[PDB]
Task: inverse folding
């Protein structure tokens, strides 16, 4: 799957660095203080990583009715789990969270 | 889950009517000649049908870095199968297709 533009300018995994205060987590989360958020970002042109036939249909109809039908969007096909330490009402916990970080990307 | 604007102006299932020629299917597909494509369309504002915590993070970071991080997108949470009749190399078939029509929607 080759990107038209770029490559790397189409839907793919990016890392976005975010503080706890950026995330709105600083009251509850104690660590990590900086999160390396992996996320899916980039254009979804025709036949680029189409998740399924619905995506192809959206491509076709977006071209013909662009004020009505949006293009396919770059979204996570899967996630990577992540560990956080956070404050509880009565203590502190180290907890795994499964759908925080995107692992791979496709156009849907 | 109440939409801010609308309601119905946020991410939800729409029906878009499409001809075979619209879809690029007219060479192969014989019926139906008009498809009632159910698709997920609409804004994804804060806390609106967030699929998961990744979506919330995207909301937060989109506000702070809007040229870098896109908003959550309205995408199908599930699909409805569909029957088509189409031409083959050597004949014709009636075939079920599972991920053509969106069944419900969420912001991801």
Result:
């Amino acid at each position: 799957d080759h990107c038209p533009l770029g490559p790397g300018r189409c839907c793919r995994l990016h890392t976005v660095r975010a503080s706890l205060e950026d995330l709105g987590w600083a009251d509850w989360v104690l660590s990590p203080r900086e999160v390396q958020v992996t996320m899916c970002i980039g254009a979804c042109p025709s036949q680029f990583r189409a998740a399924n036939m619905h995506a192809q249909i959206k491509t076709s109809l977006h071209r013909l009715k662009p004020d009505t039908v949006p293009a396919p969007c770059c979204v996570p096909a899967s996630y990577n789990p992540m560990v956080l330490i956070q404050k509880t009402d009565t203590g502190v916990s180290l907890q795994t969270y499964d759908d925080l970080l995107a692992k791979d990307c496709h156009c849907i």
In short: Strands of chain A lie at 12-19, 29-31, 34-41, 74-87, 92-107. Chain A has one domain: 1-108.
